Design a binder for this molecule. Structure first.
Ligand SMILES: NC(=O)c1ccc[n+]([C@@H]2O[C@H](COP(=O)([O-])OP(=O)(O)OC[C@H]3O[C@@H](n4cnc5c(N)ncnc54)[C@H](O)[C@@H]3O)[C@@H](O)[C@H]2O)c1
Ligand SMILES: NC(=O)[C@H]1CCCCc2c1[nH]c1ccc(Cl)cc21
Ligand SMILES: [Zn+2]
Length: 272
């Protein structure tokens, strides 16, 4: 349960699964969900008319009133931020052939900018949109204009008389099923994985939260996070800023990893 043990594991293991959440994008300028400076805290101020902050990405509320989501969607739309050190570390692991899979809970699509190939977007993305009623699929470009104008995009197939004929981006809301590729990948990966690393996630959301216990118990597990996850037992817990920790791991690993080293907590201001 030391940083030296994490390095030893990183040097020895060849089929690594990295599970990431909103914590890895905090340094990029994207807030997480549940921290004091998270999405929920910001939603409580900026969208006080919601029953609760969780309603913004809840399928039941979206069906009732989709206007708040399309007021907010442009704020979380991909293509405006740069990848963190963590993204680059995962990308290098992939190039080095050591990465089995990066399961990401983020929709920011920074993995694509960083160059991570072996990637699963567990909670979907803005790349496609789907009608609530008829399940008609479009690519993002068909609905991009409506999103940036804060307008509710309507289904071309369904009649104008149907109120729920709304083109919803295929990001996974509460109450929705995850993309099939997630279940497909886990079915194969669980028998191949030789190391599991969780970075920047509270693991409070099913079924992704079930991954750490769905793989063989004998597989070593590392946590890189600001806080411990009380419900889960890890073999190594590296507690603190994930970029600081990864930067320290990169120094100790050397070679190509040491080339990623930088100053992740130098004095800086993030602008709006
Ligand atoms: N209606 C809703 O509210 C709703 C709907 C759909 C999905 N969700 C989901 O909630 C899911 C789970 O959230 P999550 O785990 O990704 O985020 P989270 O906010 O729950 O947890 C982020 C974790 O990372 C840590 N962290 C933050 N910054 C860090 C840093 N710089 N270094 C190290 N650690 C850091 C935090 O302490 C926290 O433990 C999201 O993927 C989202 O899909 C919520
Ligand atoms: N960095 C991400 O992309 C995170 C954190 C920023 C808010 C949007 C968001 C994220 N993850 C999600 C998963 C599902 C939904 Cl509906 C929305 C989100
Ligand atoms: Zn339709």
């Amino acid at each position: 349960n030391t940083i030296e043990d994490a390095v030893k594991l990183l040097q020895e293991c060849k089929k690594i699964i990295v599970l990431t959440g909103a914590g890895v994008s905090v340094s990029c300028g994207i807030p997480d969900f549940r921290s004091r400076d998270g999405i929920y805290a910001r939603l409580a101020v900026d969208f006080p008319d919601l029953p609760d902050p969780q309603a913004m990405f809840d399928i039941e509320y979206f069906r009732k009133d989709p206007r708040p989501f399309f007021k907010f969607a442009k704020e979380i739309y991909p293509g405006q931020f740069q990848p963190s050190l963590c993204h680059k570390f995962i990308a290098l692991s992939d190039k080095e052939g050591k990465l089995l899979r990066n399961y990401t809970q983020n929709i920011d699509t920074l993995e694509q900018v960083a160059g991570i190939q072996r990637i699963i977007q567990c909670h979907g993305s803005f790349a496609t949109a789907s009608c609530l009623i008829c399940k008609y699929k479009v690519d993002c470009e068909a609905v991009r204009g409506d999103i940036f104008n804060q307008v509710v995009p309507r289904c071309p197939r369904c009649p104008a008389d149907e109120p729920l004929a709304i083109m919803k981006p295929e990001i996974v809301f509460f109450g929705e099923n995850l993309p099939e590729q997630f279940h497909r990948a886990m079915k194969y990966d669980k028998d191949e994985v030789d190391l599991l690393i969780v970075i920047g996630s509270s693991l409070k959301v099913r079924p992704v939260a079930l991954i750490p216990s769905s793989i063989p118990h004998e597989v070593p597990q590392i946590l890189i996070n600001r806080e411990p996850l009380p419900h889960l037992h890890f073999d190594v817990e590296l507690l603190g800023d994930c970029d600081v920790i990864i930067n320290e791991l990169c120094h100790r690993l050397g070679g190509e990893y040491a080339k990623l080293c930088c100053n992740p907590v130098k004095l800086s201001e993030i602008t709006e």
